[PDB]
Amino acid sequence: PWELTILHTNDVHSRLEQTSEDSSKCVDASRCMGGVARLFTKVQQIRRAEPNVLLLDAGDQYQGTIWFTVYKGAEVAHFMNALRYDAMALGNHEFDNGVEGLIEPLLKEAKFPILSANISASGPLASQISGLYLPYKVLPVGDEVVGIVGYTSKETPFLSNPGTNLVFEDEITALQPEVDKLKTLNVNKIIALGHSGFEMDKLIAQKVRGVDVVVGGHSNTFLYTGNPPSKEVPAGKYPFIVTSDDGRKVPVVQAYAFGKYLGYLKIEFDERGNVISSHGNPILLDSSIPEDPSIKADINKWRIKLDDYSTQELGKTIVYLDGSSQSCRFRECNMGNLICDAMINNNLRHADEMFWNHVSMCILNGGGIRSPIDERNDGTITWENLAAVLPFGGTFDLVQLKGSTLKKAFEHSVHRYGQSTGEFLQVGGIHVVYDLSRKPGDRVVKLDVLCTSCRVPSYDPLKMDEVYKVILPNFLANGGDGFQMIKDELLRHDSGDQDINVVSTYISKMKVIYPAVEGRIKFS
Amino acid sequence: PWELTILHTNDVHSRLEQTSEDSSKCVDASRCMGGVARLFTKVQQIRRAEPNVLLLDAGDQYQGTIWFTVYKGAEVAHFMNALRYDAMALGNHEFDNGVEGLIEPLLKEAKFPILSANISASGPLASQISGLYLPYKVLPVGDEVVGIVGYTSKETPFLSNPGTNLVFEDEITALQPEVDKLKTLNVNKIIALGHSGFEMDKLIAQKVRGVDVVVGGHSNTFLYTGNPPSKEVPAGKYPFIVTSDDGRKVPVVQAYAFGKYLGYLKIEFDERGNVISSHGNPILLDSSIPEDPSIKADINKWRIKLDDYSTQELGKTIVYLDGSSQSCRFRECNMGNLICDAMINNNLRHADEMFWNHVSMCILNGGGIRSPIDERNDGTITWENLAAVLPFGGTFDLVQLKGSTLKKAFEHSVHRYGQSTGEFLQVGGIHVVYDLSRKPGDRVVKLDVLCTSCRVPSYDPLKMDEVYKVILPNFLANGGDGFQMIKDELLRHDSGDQDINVVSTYISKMKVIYPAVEGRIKFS
Numbered sequence A, B: 001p002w003e004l005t006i007l008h009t010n011d012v013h014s015r016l017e018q019t020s021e022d023s024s025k026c027v028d029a030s031r032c033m034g035g036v037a038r039l040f041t042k043v044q045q046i047r048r049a050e051p052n053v054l055l056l057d058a059g060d061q062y063q064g065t066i067w068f069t070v071y072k073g074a075e076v077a078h079f080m081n082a083l084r085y086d087a088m089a090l091g092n093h094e095f096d097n098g099v100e101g102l103i104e105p106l107l108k109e110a111k112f113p114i115l116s117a118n119i120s121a122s123g124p125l126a127s128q129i130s131g132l133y134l135p136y137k138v139l140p141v142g143d144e145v146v147g148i149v150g151y152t153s154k155e156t157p158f159l160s161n162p163g164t165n166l167v168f169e170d171e172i173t174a175l176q177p178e179v180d181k182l183k184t185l186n187v188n189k190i191i192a193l194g195h196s197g198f199e200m201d202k203l204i205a206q207k208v209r210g211v212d213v214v215v216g217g218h219s220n221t222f223l224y225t226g227n228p229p230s231k232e233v234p235a236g237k238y239p240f241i242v243t244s245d246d247g248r249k250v251p252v253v254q255a256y257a258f259g260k261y262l263g264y265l266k267i268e269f270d271e272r273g274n275v276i277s278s279h280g281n282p283i284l285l286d287s288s289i290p291e292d293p294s295i296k297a298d299i300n301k302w303r304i305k306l307d308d309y310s311t312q313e314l315g316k317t318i319v320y321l322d323g324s325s326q327s328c329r330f331r332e333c334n335m336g337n338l339i340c341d342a343m344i345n346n347n348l349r350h351a352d353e354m355f356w357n358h359v360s361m362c363i364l365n366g367g368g369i370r371s372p373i374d375e376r377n378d379g380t381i382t383w384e385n386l387a388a389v390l391p392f393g394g395t396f397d398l399v400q401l402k403g404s405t406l407k408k409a410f411e412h413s414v415h416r417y418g419q420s421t422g423e424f425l426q427v428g429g430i431h432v433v434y435d436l437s438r439k440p441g442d443r444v445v446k447l448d449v450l451c452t453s454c455r456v457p458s459y460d461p462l463k464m465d466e467v468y469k470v471i472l473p474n475f476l477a478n479g480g481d482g483f484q485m486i487k488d489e490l491l492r493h494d495s496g497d498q499d500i501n502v503v504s505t506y507i508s509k510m511k512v513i514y515p516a517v518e519g520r521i522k523f524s
């Protein structure tokens, strides 16, 4: 029997450096985790021990820290090349800087194939990008070959900036003929590597005949067999076994996010490429694994331009940016309004004739706003200043919420008003009026929302049965601050861009900002 | 006795081409007026007849049409050089593109001196600009010399973009020592040429000992002796005689604006440079004076780049820009909100620690909005599209209004609501609520205004006795649409930038716009 070790990462999201346990900035080095220097140590150790190894990435290296802001993908090509990845699938965030920001820094500099079978181009872009990503690659491993077939979320147009040339096809429709073709070319071991989320990964394992293994991403899914080694609660066993329509057992794997774990799956194949067995577990990249000294030194050299960038002027404010708790946990604050306006600007995507933009609404817990910014430094705003306001290493995510859920959220926002608690909501595209003289849970007396399915944006009353797209911090999407209704009732959740980066991009685009307190939130 | 003919223009404001009677676009060529080609004819005729002639400009050639937008002052240097101006004083609009946009296109290319005695520079700018404008110039005329001493509005920092290096000194304080100095250099004929307004011109004639004649601008003041030749109603005789503190009669002249008239003043001087007599009148540049064929052909050659520019994309909208009368004469319309937001953006000037910006408020009569802009042309917005929305050739001016005056304006806005009349006000920095069930003149039930003297902009109730800065169209500042209270009660009025240009600049800066209807105007 021929044994393959599949090492895999997904949704690394610009965590080039080691992180805290929660994937935010490393403070207590002795307890820090992940980073590419530590990954390198572990991959090197495994490749000493196991003859047949693939190292695969299921997409979403782009976006997440100042690394991406400054280096724009060059850091991904450089450090993935240093780790000698065998292949990567395109994720939705690989489109954050458009097609041009994928071609130049990554497709042209990666020393490994970059895969997606379900993305097609037309017009002059088709000629420009031909062969720079591939539907699949057949890779030699020892004396055998393994086909790797890529896929990318059909939803990428709503979750990134791919432009209007590229078409994202249904994954199973696109995959099946490519898998069928590899069979005709005497390739009998096939891995589907891609970036659509655990639920689509399970459908691909089930329905795409000839796929032996699915290595996925996007949903930051943590799978484990046994007692988990850290804070992450498993969503299922590792690997997750799907029974295919042809009756085979097909392992499905993912490895959380943020470079905290290395996926590790051992597959035994018979002579005909059938999976006889599969077992493994992600490996927690904790401090017991030393950071490779050479990779670490290279990371520290690359950090210099980040430190320099962090104190550069991004733009100016002519107003005090009031991110004080005494304001932002009690009433509409202009820093809240700025951040929500930035969130909506970041989520301007291509529109249909059916909507001016797919999303118009934002909520932000006031406890997430951690500093004001004084305007008396010649109006200057720096990344360092924004990192004081938004220090937690989060993202601004897209969710779908029924109006009833959102009304429950606004009641929760003021359920114990007056104690300077973090749940008070700052907003964009929402006008709320509270009456604090009413009972907790009946304090919202008006709630109007900005239309999307309209050519002229205007406010109308919230409808309890209607589903709304909302941009909000991942802290809230995950039920932080007692927003259990958001976690339990949401219909869709997709991780978005780094919180600091969303604000920095908006300030840079606006050049001079002057956010007002304008009556988004009133008390009667 | 030595006779001088002073020919003078002021506040030409980019009217390079002949205009309609109201200084807007020429439609019926047979009845059009002004323009540099016609000016050239008249100046040439006078210089054939009169031995001693000066041709002077009292500032504000910059700003007013697409000429300035595209050519940025190069057209001013080129066509003023072709007319062989003898001198120009700096106006406030010569600072609209900063110091850099004055130095490069105008100061470096003018073949005549550019004057201002009351503007001083510091730091490296002082070295950069030294001698490029002058306090005065002594000019030979026939066998004599005439000193010309310049001045510019002390208010220029609130009315343009001069930057924080330049200091605008009190005019009389700065002028007197320069006039005193010219006397010591055997210069006994002195003209004060400058750009502060008729009222300051009269104070300079009165108080600056040794000034023989004041040639002014800024206030678009029309002076005439006799029956006026066109629609403009004289503010006084031409010249306007001030009695100086030393007992001399000092003529004060101005010549309206927009190149419609050529000022023409004949001065008789005795051997000691005392004015014996002064008489004249502005000359209406109407169609009875032919356009010089050579200058006209040059103007038509320069027009090609304007025609090309007019159809270029300035930016994009992802929303329908609703400038329909059915919206903008009846309720808050998003085109109204866009234009007011552009007006406030244009009037961001240097701030004190005493205000975030000197002005926060905008009103715009809905009848001034003449077209929507459809977003389905790939979102494109062109100058041609904006010229359909704002076709009247106006400006967005700065006024000071008591709150009582503004409340009367908002009552007038809805006094006969429901007939699709033009007086209905679109707004920025103002939240109004009407109750149309009340009597005309008592329909405003809430009126809140955005603070200026605050570090965080917020809304507070309008105060009847407080004076507010407001940006509004010149149509309204002049009492159009029955807004007689604005004309009769305002405390200050200064002409601003071309209406189309204000919007085009804002769209270009924003790149992608999405103005909403947001509750600035409500009905109860």
Ligand SMILES: Nc1ccn([C@@H]2O[C@H](COP(=O)(O)O)[C@@H](O)[C@H]2O)c(=O)n1
Residues within 6 Å of the ligand: A365, A366, A367, A368, A369, A392, A421, A422, A423, A475, A481
């Ligand atoms: N990752 C996190 C952690 C806390 N927070 C906020 O910080 C608040 C707690 O801050 P204090 O300890 O300053 O009260 C929480 O109630 C929540 O609003 C957040 O927004 N994101």
Ligand SMILES: Nc1ccn([C@@H]2O[C@H](COP(=O)(O)O)[C@@H](O)[C@H]2O)c(=O)n1
Residues within 6 Å of the ligand: B365, B366, B367, B368, B369, B392, B421, B422, B423, B475, B481
């Ligand atoms: N120079 C002008 C002339 C008219 N107007 C507007 O045009 C309106 C008249 O338009 P109608 O004829 O379309 O009703 C006026 O009531 C006024 O609001 C303007 O804003 N500026």
Ligand SMILES: [Ca+2]
Residues within 6 Å of the ligand: A188, A189, A190, A210, A211, A212, A272, A273, A274, A275
């Ligand atoms: Ca197989």
Ligand SMILES: [Ca+2]
Residues within 6 Å of the ligand: B188, B189, B190, B210, B211, B212, B272, B273, B274, B275
């Ligand atoms: Ca004299």
Ligand SMILES: [Cl-]
Residues within 6 Å of the ligand: A196, A197, A198, A199, A200, A219
């Ligand atoms: Cl999923």
Ligand SMILES: [Cl-]
Residues within 6 Å of the ligand: B196, B197, B198, B199, B200, B219
């Ligand atoms: Cl005046």
Ligand SMILES: [Zn+2]
Residues within 6 Å of the ligand: A011, A013, A060, A091, A093, A218, A219, A495
């Ligand atoms: Zn991701």
Ligand SMILES: [Zn+2]
Residues within 6 Å of the ligand: A060, A091, A092, A093, A195, A217, A218, A219
């Ligand atoms: Zn993803």
Ligand SMILES: [Zn+2]
Residues within 6 Å of the ligand: B011, B013, B060, B091, B093, B218, B219, B495
């Ligand atoms: Zn002027």
Ligand SMILES: [Zn+2]
Residues within 6 Å of the ligand: B060, B091, B092, B093, B195, B217, B218, B219
């Ligand atoms: Zn002026």
